[PDB]
């Protein structure tokens, strides 16, 4: 086909995690305002069936995150790797940075289940490393984290990006995590069929320009 | 009997993402003094089979619209919330109260919000013949604040959600230019546990904290 961002009115469909939405969308829409102001963007969670078939059909253009299932017929590219960080409200009575493992186990925690994303492991990685945490609140997803941490003496274990997005708006501070946790690798997946498609290419290159390290 | 100051029970609460964002901070803040040894865990209403889970006792309370819960379920109105138009405060052109004209002229973020009272909006507007430049459509509300803060987009969003996001993201709101209905936000619990001291107490706390009935 052909592609002119100035004029293009095409709809792009992006699969991403909720945090992925929170992190990618604002600087992307900000960029798209000056680069392709007439195209449309719609996001969806990866779980919603069926990612392989939909990406193969063209219903979904790109996908971002761990998404380990996509292998054959899929090009991928790593935008960045992110570390886990301990985050809490700045005026916290006792929390300190860098935080000791002892204090970590002593304090009370909010847990994000984060089922079927790479961030679901943490609550188990800590358990298998023999680190007791007082789980005062357990929520499925990350949306309520900032608000909760701001109004309580709770602490949370979140990826560094979620921390940076929330630090200023909710008066939160962070701390290098007291527990040896792995990094998460964040990739950009696109189907091999559309590897040469000008539009898909352009949007890809934009994602790389914006987010890659 | 049930003693909050001593109890170490886990309570399970079914609620939407916005519901989480709104109910959870002032609740945990309150529980810090009243019952500092209990545990709370939340979940979306769609996950699992909610009636069976609530009847079995896996889920204690559920908050929202939830028209599915009719029989064997007692409900209690916590409040009524109205739709509001939100955007960043330093917006080049957006004004409050916002004119319907300007609303149709500006660009929008849509939250699909499937299986919610909030899902209807995108349709209610269409059937009222109101065109919108849907620049970005997202499934849920999590990315809204950040997006609005960084772009000249505007969004149709529930009153309380707006209240949560105004201060952190430097957002202003506006009475919605379109005639939209109010959503009724209720507290549901199963009839089996209507007399259960713990469940009763937690209900009473939810009423004390969030009910606007008397005033």
Author numbering:
A (entry chain B): 88 to 300
B (entry chain A): 89 to 303
The paper states:
of transcription factors found in prokaryotes.
configuration formed by the association of two symmetry-related dimers. apo-DntR above, the conformations of their IBCs to be very similar. suggested, acting as mimics of bound salicylate.
